[PDB]
Design an enzyme around this catalytic site. Structure first.
Site, PDB file in Angstrom:
ATOM      1  CD  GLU A   1       1.008  -1.296  -5.222  1.00  0.00           C
ATOM      2  OE1 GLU A   1       1.383  -2.364  -4.336  1.00  0.00           O
ATOM      3  OE2 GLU A   1       1.179   0.488  -4.706  1.00  0.00           O
TER       4      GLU A   1
ATOM      5  CE  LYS B   1      -0.166   8.936  -5.080  1.00  0.00           C
ATOM      6  NZ  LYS B   1      -0.428   9.404  -4.237  1.00  0.00           N
TER       7      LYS B   1
ATOM      8  CE1 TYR C   1       2.309   5.718  -4.673  1.00  0.00           C
ATOM      9  CE2 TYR C   1       2.360   6.419  -2.460  1.00  0.00           C
ATOM     10  CZ  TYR C   1       1.729   6.134  -3.576  1.00  0.00           C
ATOM     11  OH  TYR C   1       0.215   6.182  -3.164  1.00  0.00           O
TER      12      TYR C   1
ATOM     13  CE  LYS D   1      -1.835   3.615  -5.280  1.00  0.00           C
ATOM     14  NZ  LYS D   1      -1.487   3.545  -3.461  1.00  0.00           N
ATOM     15  CB  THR D   2      -2.882   0.672  -0.269  1.00  0.00           C
ATOM     16  OG1 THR D   2      -1.655   1.608  -0.509  1.00  0.00           O
ATOM     17  CG2 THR D   2      -3.202  -0.993  -0.090  1.00  0.00           C
ATOM     18  N   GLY D   3      -5.046   3.619  -0.715  1.00  0.00           N
ATOM     19  CA  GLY D   3      -4.827   4.484  -0.207  1.00  0.00           C
ATOM     20  C   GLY D   3      -5.866   5.228   1.033  1.00  0.00           C
ATOM     21  CB  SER D   4      -3.984   6.633   4.091  1.00  0.00           C
ATOM     22  OG  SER D   4      -4.257   4.747   4.126  1.00  0.00           O
TER      23      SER D   4
ATOM     24  CB  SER E   1      -2.627   7.215  -2.761  1.00  0.00           C
ATOM     25  OG  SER E   1      -2.004   7.894  -1.946  1.00  0.00           O
TER      26      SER E   1
HETATM   27  B1  LIG Z   1      -0.862   7.595  -0.573  1.00  0.00           B
HETATM   28  O1  LIG Z   1      -2.891   6.792  -0.333  1.00  0.00           O
HETATM   29  O2  LIG Z   1      -0.018   6.400  -1.082  1.00  0.00           O
HETATM   30  C1  LIG Z   1      -0.422   8.850  -0.484  1.00  0.00           C
HETATM   31  C2  LIG Z   1       0.288   8.827   0.406  1.00  0.00           C
HETATM   32  N1  LIG Z   1       0.686   7.950   1.803  1.00  0.00           N
HETATM   33  C3  LIG Z   1       0.871   8.948   3.436  1.00  0.00           C
HETATM   34  C4  LIG Z   1       0.817   8.364   3.869  1.00  0.00           C
HETATM   35  C5  LIG Z   1       0.767   9.312   5.234  1.00  0.00           C
HETATM   36  O3  LIG Z   1       1.351  10.462   5.621  1.00  0.00           O
HETATM   37  O4  LIG Z   1       0.743   7.937   6.214  1.00  0.00           O
HETATM   38  N2  LIG Z   1      -0.338   7.738   3.454  1.00  0.00           N
HETATM   39  N3  LIG Z   1      -0.731   7.593   1.972  1.00  0.00           N
HETATM   40  N4  LIG Z   1      -1.085   9.548   0.532  1.00  0.00           N
HETATM   41  C6  LIG Z   1      -1.665  10.366   1.194  1.00  0.00           C
HETATM   42  O5  LIG Z   1      -0.300  11.281   0.725  1.00  0.00           O
HETATM   43  C7  LIG Z   1      -2.104  11.309   1.546  1.00  0.00           C
HETATM   44  C8  LIG Z   1      -2.322  11.311   3.052  1.00  0.00           C
HETATM   45  C9  LIG Z   1      -1.449  12.910   2.990  1.00  0.00           C
HETATM   46  C10 LIG Z   1      -1.468  12.587   4.960  1.00  0.00           C
HETATM   47  C11 LIG Z   1      -2.143  11.445   5.361  1.00  0.00           C
HETATM   48  S1  LIG Z   1      -1.945  10.237   3.910  1.00  0.00           S
END
Ligand SMILES: *[B]([O])([O])[C]([C]N1[C]=C(C([O])=O)N=N1)[N]C(=O)[C]C1=[C][C]=[C]S1
Length: 358
Positions: free
Chosen positions: A272, A67, A150, A312-315, A64
């Site tokens: 943010e 973004k 979100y 901002k965080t992202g995963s 994320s």
């Molecule tokens: B972003 O990193 O904020 C976004 C939202 N998200 C969902 C999750 C989760 O399902 O635990 N973590 N962050 N990231 C994504 O949509 C990519 C991902 C898809 C599946 C796991 S992270």
């Protein structure tokens, strides 16, 4: 008296390094930028099976944090007169003209306030046709503009529209126009065959090696990959937008503008934003289950602070990211990991480091 670089290394070793053992994370890259000096710290392995160390060439999935590049491209388009944030999607994706979604404006899509778009598309939506049909079939639920939920589809659609306005697909918008304007050399929507040796594996919760799956409007929502040096350069651009040419400078500054609040968090474009100084708890609250996963009625900004900080965080399933910068102190930090760890741990380690430096 101890040189600055060793001082920063010690702070990172105190605060980030113990996360590796605690969460069994194979590799990590942490950078700090302070007054235009860059510090880079690398730990562990980009590939466990290949015994390959994390280094300045390692490419990580940003999730994320991607973004932020989408928001920047939207800022770039808007300030070039290619879109207005008051436009609706049907102006550019003609197949949505006069459908219910065409009642939502670009800014409401970029900032998650359509009032009926959830975190993910349904799993069955994959092809460009299925995405189109999803949006044509869409209908309103909550009043438009009043509730933040979100959403990948919401900001994905924004990204698509931005690309259509610039007459290029979204991957080419980033790779041909936006990355080169920020001076980034190793950031990708699609990692080319000649760099695959630098693309870390991500690792899931059983420490099994994995990489992100293809998905609908993946690139604008969570599909960028980059390196630590690149991410430091991006933070440098956000800290010093005046040092960049007009078009990208205005784009960066556009991403910093708060649009509404949810309590102490100001929703800017991608980023943010918080009143600076910010307490740890304010930064933690931005990432609570209730803010991230549920709808929240927004409030018009009724106090605009003079001095701000941004994060901002992202995963992805296999990677974690956190970026934060503070213009008043001309400082910022990037964390990349090739295994998700709790957002709370990312934010707190970064908090302690940035506040201790000097
Ligand atoms: B972003 O990193 O904020 C976004 C939202 N998200 C969902 C999750 C989760 O399902 O635990 N973590 N962050 N990231 C994504 O949509 C990519 C991902 C898809 C599946 C796991 S992270």
């Amino acid at each position: 008296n101890t040189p600055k670089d060793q001082e920063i290394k010690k702070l990172v070793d105190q605060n980030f390094k113990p996360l590796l053992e605690k969460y069994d994370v194979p590799g990590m890259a942490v950078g700090v930028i302070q007054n235009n000096k860059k510090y880079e710290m690398y730990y562990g392995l980009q590939s466990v099976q290949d015994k390959k160390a994390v280094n300045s060439n390692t490419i990580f999935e940003l999730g994320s944090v991607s973004k932020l590049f989408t928001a920047t491209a939207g800022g770039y388009a808007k300030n070039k007169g290619k879109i207005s944030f008051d436009d609706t999607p049907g102006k550019y994706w003609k197949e949505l003209k006069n459908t219910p979604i065409d009642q939502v404006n670009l800014l409401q899509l970029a900032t998650y306030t359509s009032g009926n778009l959830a975190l993910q598309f349904p799993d069955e939506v994959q092809t460009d046709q299925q995405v189109l049909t999803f949006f044509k079939d869409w209908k309103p639920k909550n009043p438009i503009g009043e509730y933040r939920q979100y959403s990948n589809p919401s900001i994905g659609l924004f990204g698509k529209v931005v690309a259509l306005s610039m007459n290029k697909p979204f991957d080419q918008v980033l790779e041909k126009t936006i990355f080169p304007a920020l001076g980034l050399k190793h950031s990708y929507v699609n990692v080319p065959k000649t760099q695959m040796q630098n693309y870390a594996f991500g690792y899931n919760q059983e420490n099994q090696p994995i990489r992100v799956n293809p998905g609908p409007l993946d690139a604008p929502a969570y599909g960028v990959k980059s390196t630590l040096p690149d991410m430091l350069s991006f933070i440098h651009a956000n800290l010093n937008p005046q040092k960049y040419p007009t078009d990208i400078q205005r784009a960066i500054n556009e991403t910093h503008q708060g649009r509404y609040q949810v309590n102490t968090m100001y929703q800017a474009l991608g980023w943010e934003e918080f009143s600076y100084p910010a307490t740890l708890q304010t930064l933690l609250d931005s990432n609570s289950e209730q803010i991230v996963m549920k709808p929240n009625k927004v409030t018009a900004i009724s106090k605009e602070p003079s001095v701000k900080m941004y994060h901002k965080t992202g995963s992805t399933s296999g990677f974690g990211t956190y970026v934060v910068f503070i213009p008043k102190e001309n400082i910022g930090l990037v964390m990349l990991t090739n295994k998700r760890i709790p957002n709370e741990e990312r934010i707190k380690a970064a908090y302690v480091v940035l506040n201790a430096i000097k």
